[PDB]
Symmetry: none
Subunit: 233 residues, 2 copies
């Protein structure tokens, strides 16, 4: 429904060097959720997104990896239910892989509302199992919602453009899937995009998932069809 | 003097799918240079090789094309003078063209030593000019060294087996030709092999080149000499 590029255009990106950390603070009680956008200047991204509530509480945390931050925009809407919440972005890659970070308060008409509107009836994934969501070349981004009935959430989202060709991996953890649902948009440029949702918790910790098509462009451009010509110089 | 097959047999090749990217890290200062070997299972090769030093500095990059990766092994030696470096091997081909990649530290008595040992006094190519290096059928591989006096190196290397029959194209860039020379071993199976070196820098940007036969078979095997009986089936 909404292009993640537009949101990044009207933002103020902040540079986070490899091995460094930045924090955003949100004390206004009207901030229901925040949206984190992570981009790079072409190189792979390796980040850690954590929600800190008290002195030693981390109810929400992610381990992110993107092969090309310039092409693909990372996105996750994080709930900020109670009290002051500080979001922490930690670039865990080496000095060669800087990233840009935008985390700002969400809105009632923001990404979360669109993700909920596009969502389809969720399906159950048992602990230690996984689900696969093939998407057709017409889809540019997909909305992902992960929920539980009250148990802690331990999942791993993988975007594949091939048999074992991982383009984006998100190892997420939430203390309560019912109270703290996981929202995220995965951009799917190209063709052969397959979303694998892996429930890494033991068998007695099922979760609910719903991966729908979010942004479809309807390109269908076939100018490249024909003889393949190498670089001309 | 040395066969690329001998080294590639004592290595651990890594598959890079079309559109993917693998990276290596060499933080050890004892690593003076790394040799990069790329192959395929008979299908064409199309890869980008880059050296990453800082957050946004790529002082050594290479755009590579090989018509057949099984017959022809791409080889290059990349200098890593200062600090930690990571080599980025990007497969820019389509899904149909996977490549196998080896990048391991070079040694004192490795390829750079051999390429230097076989090298002959270098000649100059003016900016915007080109040079041609024909070779006789007995030579299987040739060693190429490119240098400048300190200015960035912008050169294109081409291998032809006919008038306009490109078999291997390497468009290389370097930030400092004196500090960062280009080393490479280009395989020349068969006959009619001509190595072309084009200086792509502006007219006032000369470079130094040396193209010498590295391995000569001398086997004198001429089994095909005689009746070319069509496939007997």
């Amino acid at each position: 429904x909404x292009x993640x590029x537009x949101x990044w255009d009207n933002s103020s990106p902040v540079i986070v060097q490899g091995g460094s950390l930045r924090t955003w603070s949100f004390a206004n009680p009207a901030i229901e959720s925040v949206q984190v956008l992570l981009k790079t200047e072409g190189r792979p991204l390796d980040a850690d997104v954590e929600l800190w509530q008290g002195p030693d509480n981390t109810p929400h945390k992610m381990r992110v990896y993107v092969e090309d931050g310039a092409l693909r925009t990372f996105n996750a809407v994080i709930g900020t239910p109670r009290g002051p919440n500080t979001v922490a972005i930690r670039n865990i890659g080496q000095l060669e892989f800087p990233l840009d970070a935008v985390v700002r308060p969400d809105r009632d008409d923001g990404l979360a509302a669109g993700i909920a509107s596009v969502a389809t009836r969720s399906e159950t994934i048992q602990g230690g199992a996984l689900r696969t969501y093939p998407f057709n070349p017409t889809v540019d981004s997909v909305a992902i919602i992960l929920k539980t009935d009250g148990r802690p959430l331990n999942a791993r989202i993988e975007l594949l453009q091939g048999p074992n060709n991982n383009k984006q991996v998100v190892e997420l953890y939430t203390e309560d899937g019912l109270d703290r649902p996981f929202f995220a948009i995965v951009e799917t440029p190209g063709s052969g995009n397959v979303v694998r949702v892996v429930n890494t918790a033991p068998v007695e910790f099922p979760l609910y998932a719903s991966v729908d098509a979010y942004r479809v462009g309807g390109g269908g451009d076939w100018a490249d069809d024909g003889l393949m010509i190498g670089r001309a110089f």
